[PDB]
Amino acid sequence: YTFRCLQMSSFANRSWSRTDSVVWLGDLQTHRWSNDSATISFTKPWSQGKLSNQQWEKLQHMFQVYRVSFTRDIQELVKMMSPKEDYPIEIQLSAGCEMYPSESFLHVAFQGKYVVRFWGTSWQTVPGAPSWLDLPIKVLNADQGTSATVQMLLNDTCPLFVRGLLEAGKSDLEKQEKPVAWLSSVPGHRQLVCHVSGFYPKPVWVMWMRGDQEQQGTHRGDFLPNADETWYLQATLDVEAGEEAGLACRVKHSSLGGQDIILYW
């Protein structure tokens, strides 16, 4: 499980700006914070984790302060931008921890490209980032309090909280949901499509079969989300006319027991 806090910031000019955050544990959204809300919203019964109402109060406040301080500091640091203080500015932060039976991260993108990371005890630019960024990151690395606060959040606060999240939403992260499959085809060669939807967790096995012969050339689509946090996936096979008869789609998933789905074309 990877825990990620995802912040998206849009700076249109010197005086219009919005920032929004969404937080994920594995592939389940746990929180949301819109620009127009003073407070973070939980999107899960267990989003507060094993934290006290005061443990949540304090931490929320740290973030409320931070959100204001980030808005104003970027506005300042943007003046130092190369050729001219260029507009629409888009900033993105990905922060959190990769929880193993943990390693933390804090990455920053500017204009859609990864330019900055916090690493160890300080901010550093990434190789091939715009050189105009070096000074802004010097100014920032002079703030010893923030650096200490960021070290505490990454090294200590994040892992502890996430651990509380995992205990609290065990029954949700452990939920098992069954795929339902159906077949179709598209237009003398044709493409056979096996659609597989409504399954959870994400890991799945779909394949066109000719008896016990796995059909290499079965092409898997991408995982597409459904609204209720189940997945959708389809797998296809190119077939000549009269190559259709004898073919089946086989789906294995954790939730089926040892009872695969086999649908015959």
Ligand X SMILES: *[C@@H]1O[C@H](CO)[C@@H](O[C@@H]2O[C@H](CO)[C@@H](O)[C@H](O)[C@H]2NC(C)=O)[C@H](O)[C@H]1NC(C)=O
Ligand Y SMILES: CCCCCCCCCCCCCC[C@@H](O)[C@@H](O)[C@H](CO[C@H]1O[C@H](CO)[C@H](O)[C@H](O)[C@H]1O)NC(=O)CCCCCCC
Among 229, 164, 233, 204, smallest CA distance to 29 is for 229
Region at 26 (left for phi over 0; alpha for psi -120 to 50; beta for the rest)? left
- Site residues for ligand Y, window 106-125 (CB under 6 A)? 106, 108, 110, 116
Q: How far is the CB of 7 from ligand NAG (least distance, A)?
A: 13
Region from 52-60, 61-69, 117-125, 256-264 binding ligand X, contact rule CB under 6 A: 117-125
**Does 207 contact ligand R16 by CB under 6 A?**
no
Q: Of 25, 28, 95, 97, which lies in the binding site for ligand Y, with binding defined by CB under 6 A?
A: 95
Quote the tokens at residue 43.
């999107």
Q: How far is the CB of 179 from ligand X (least distance, A)?
A: 41
Q: How far is the CB of 122 from ligand X (least distance, A)?
A: 7
**Does 226 contact other proteins by CB under 8 A?**
yes
Q: How far is the CB of 132 from ligand Y (least distance, A)?
A: 8
Instruction: Say which entry of ligand NAG, other proteins, ligand Y, none residue 66 contacts (CB below 5 to 8 A, set by partner kind).
Output: ligand Y
**Does 119 contact ligand X by CB under 6 A?**
yes
**Does 98 contact other proteins by CB under 8 A?**
no
- Site residues for ligand NAG, window 3-22 (CB under 6 A)? 12-13, 15-18
CA distances (Å), origin 114, targets 8, 80, 108, 109: 13, 19, 6, 4
Q: Of 66, 105, 114, 265, which lies in the binding site for ligand Y, with binding defined by CB under 6 A?
A: 66
Which residue in the block uniquely carries the two structure tokens 């955050």?
21
Q: Is the Cβ–Cβ distance between 48 and 57 less than 8 Å?
A: no
CA–CA distance, 232 with 230 (Å, rounded to integer): 7
Q: Is the Cβ–Cβ distance between 237 and 200 less than 8 Å?
A: no
**Does 254 contact ligand X by CB under 6 A?**
no
Instruction: Say which entry of ligand Y, ligand NAG, other proteins, none residue 74 contacts (CB below 5 to 8 A, set by partner kind).
Output: ligand Y
Q: Of 6, 20, 29, 35, which lies in the binding site for ligand NAG, with binding defined by CB under 6 A?
A: 35
**Does 1 contact other proteins by CB under 8 A?**
no
Q: Of 1, 20, 26, 51, which lies in the binding site for other proteins, with binding defined by CB under 8 A?
A: 20
Q: Of 64, 149, 157, 197, which lies in the binding site for ligand R16, with binding defined by CB under 6 A?
A: 157
Chain contacts with ligand Y (rule: CB under 6 A)? 65-66, 69-70, 73-74, 77-78, 95, 106, 108, 110, 116, 136, 143, 145-146, 149-150
